């Protein structure tokens, strides 16, 4: 592992960040002082959920809660393939992270994000309560249930 960390090959270190993510070694990746890994995540954060989650962990441990709430909220409003329940977790985290002070950011900007995440989380829970009840309902034909699961187990719908 010395030979690994003693390298200056950049495509290599990118390939190793991806490999650590694959194997699940949050142990060793979260323990890198470097910003090089943060910058690498900032480009692909809004591309994949698993990468965004890593980026948000780096922000939170650095008391940058508002920036994580921003990543999580945009990810919940996006058209990436994300389940409704995963979008409930993202909003719930963003709601908490925007409710606490982050230095350098105005109280107004925090509250406006904590409010957008609170409303979207309220709608998401309604949608989850619906989807669950509809799937379990004995009086609903199977043919329709599959159709319900397609349109409700994804991005959050209007009221």
């Amino acid at each position: 592992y010395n030979v690994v960390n003693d390298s200056s090959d950049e495509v290599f270190h990118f390939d190793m960040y991806e490999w650590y993510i694959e194997k699940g070694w949050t142990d060793r990746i979260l323990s890198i002082d470097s910003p090089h890994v943060i910058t690498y995540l900032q480009r692909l954060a809004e591309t994949d959920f698993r990468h965004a989650e890593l980026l948000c962990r780096f922000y939170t441990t650095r008391s940058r809660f508002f920036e994580a709430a921003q990543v999580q909220t945009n990810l919940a409003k996006s058209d990436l393939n994300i389940s409704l329940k995963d979008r409930i977790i993202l909003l719930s985290r963003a709601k908490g992270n925007a409710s606490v002070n982050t230095i350098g950011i105005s109280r107004q900007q925090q509250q406006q994000l904590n409010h957008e995440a609170s409303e979207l989380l309220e709608i998401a829970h309604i949608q989850d309560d619906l989807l669950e009840r509809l799937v379990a309902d004995p009086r609903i034909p199977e043919e329709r249930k599959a159709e319900i699961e397609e349109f409700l187990d994804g991005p959050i719908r209007t009221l």
Partner: protein, 622 residues
Amino acid sequence: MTDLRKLEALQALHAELVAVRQHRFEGLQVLETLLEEQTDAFKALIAKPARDTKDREALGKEPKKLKIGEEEYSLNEDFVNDCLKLADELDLNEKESARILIDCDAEGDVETQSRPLWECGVIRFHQERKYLLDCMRLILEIAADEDIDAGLQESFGVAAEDKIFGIPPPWERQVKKFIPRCMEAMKGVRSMLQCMADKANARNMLDNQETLDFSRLSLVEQHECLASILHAAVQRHHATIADFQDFIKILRKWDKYDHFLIHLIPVLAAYITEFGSPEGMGDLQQARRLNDFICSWALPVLGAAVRAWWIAEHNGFYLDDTVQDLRGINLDEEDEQRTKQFLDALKEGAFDFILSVAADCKAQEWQDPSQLGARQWLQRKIPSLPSEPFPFSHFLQHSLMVHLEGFVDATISNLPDVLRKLRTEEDEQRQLRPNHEQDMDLERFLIIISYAYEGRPDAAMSFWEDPDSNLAGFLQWASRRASTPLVSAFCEMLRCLADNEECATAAHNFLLDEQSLTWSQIFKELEYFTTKVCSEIEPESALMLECYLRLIAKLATESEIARKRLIMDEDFNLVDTILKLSVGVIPHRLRACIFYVLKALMIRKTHEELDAMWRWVEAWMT
């Protein structure tokens, strides 16, 4: 700014807490916004990720581009060398260590301090723990402030339960408790400080001397903050017997006397108060086991003091037989056992250690020359501090004085017969062998009482409000016929119990007749010594004269009735006696005390007093 880093976030947060503490609520809305952004910080007090090999080998393999979170940075042969150096000195992860160094380049503090880049990382790392821990003390301190709005006082209270102690609020709700994390947290500070001296001494045996001194100061401050946080948490009845046993074992395994022991003293005091005294876990059965458990020690004075405090605090149960159950238990045997244990603790030097700690706590760089040699004529056998620059705080001193006054009240209201028998034993010992110096237990105890009651008139008034209480009873009983040391200790106590004018007037009215000490005997002894010197003198007589002069000066500076009476009293004529004593062959201390007494008497005077003073001066100088 708005996008502040970890360091700037804690530094700004600290300023806000001081505002609310200094009666400035202009940042209420801004304060709550910071606690939410640093929620993950308050959860873990102090935790450094272990040095991993994955980052060590990867950092040096491709030291070209670094990715931390969302931003990206470029590593060069110069910066990469600082990461490995910082990680080795502090044993910190390469990723976390790099982030610290990156914060310095952005803020650009290398020019503000003109130091190597790798050294700044050590300071920046210590600053985080300082504010991260120091800010917690302000939260609990403000949550207990009674001079603020009740609503705001409760906001910081519930917040600390969840942010610091990790306890959710009442309106909601695998995890580890706070104490076990705090104990392990303080442990890391000790191991880190120990390894620091070993490595530092090796290379020393440079431009980093001041940095090492600042790091040691930050470490001791963080340890004091952790101790205060632990004390506050224990004050909320959030402990158990396992933590108490662990703390007792850690104390038994104590090696050297230093500031850490003085910081932990109040922790054990609060532990005994919550468990030993009937003001907490009032399980009488549980207290019996702890008594035998407390009653191996690498320092006997510590065990003696602990046993004395435990006995003093636990003797409050056996006062009456109506508030608790005391059936099928003998009293005389337990009383004799506690008495012999307290006597053994005294012989081992419990009060001596307490007095040495109290003295070392208020060690001041400069002292007023009007009180030189006061309370410094005993036989101190306890080793002193190494004199390193580790100044104490104010809240710690306040808590120490409060605990000492509480212990004094308990010992006075629970063990009067013990003090009586000790005084009689000392008297008979001094009588059967005057050539030898008996023990100074009572004098040391009175000096500790004086140190406890200093600059606190709210507590000193208790000795004058109720003249029929136990406090006034002991005050009047300690004024009977005794030796020079006891009289000097009582005079010093009276002098220190005159922080204001009301207490000074009360002491004046209580000293004069309305047997206990009276001004008549004082002036008689003064005239006797004057005639003896003018027709040798022993140290005890000089000490008594100096104590009398200091007491008179204090009463004249604090009280007005005494200043107006003694100045023109025909039966005393203190001025003539002090002048006849000063014109004699005596050391300079007595002359200085007489001059200070004259100054105090002449602090507020009129034309007639000025004329009389000038007449006396001319008559005695011509």
